[PDB]
């Protein structure tokens, strides 16, 4: 398992929503395309992080309701809508923004596991 801070480090990201406590991330789900597909992958993942575009509002809001989502990694420097930030703050789920594109973010993250990179 990896800490959120280490994940932020790997993608040279920044916190839009800071964690209030330290929580481990065991798997990373790539939700680049179909939201229904990303959610199906998240269902099979424990203590997972979701990597997707900060513009994917509906997907992010649904993801923020799952019990197993521990972290959001937003790509393309796309700042999400207020609703997402508010829900993440309420849920206490850290939100990391990275300038990297989905592909590059994945490359960097794989360099920190690989078998723990599902979805896509």
From Swiss-Prot:
Q: Which family does it belong to?
A: To Synechocystis PCC 6803 slr0039.
Name of the molecule in the record: Uncharacterized protein AF_1212
- Give from-to of the shown chain within the full protein: 206 to 325 of 352
């Amino acid at each position: 398992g990896l800490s959120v801070e280490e994940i932020r480090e790997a993608v040279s990201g920044e916190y839009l929503i800071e964690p209030r406590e330290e929580k481990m991330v065991e798997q990373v789900v790539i939700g680049a395309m179909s939201p229904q597909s990303a959610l199906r992958y998240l269902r099979e993942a424990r203590n997972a992080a979701l990597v997707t575009g900060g513009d994917r509002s509906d997907l992010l809001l649904t993801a923020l309701e799952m019990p197993n989502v521990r972290c959001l990694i937003l790509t393309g420097n796309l700042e999400p809508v207020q609703l997402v930030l508010t829900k993440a703050e309420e849920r206490g789920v850290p939100v990391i923004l990275t300038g990297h594109d989905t592909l590059t973010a994945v490359s960097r993250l794989e360099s920190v596991f690989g078998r723990t990179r599902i979805r896509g």
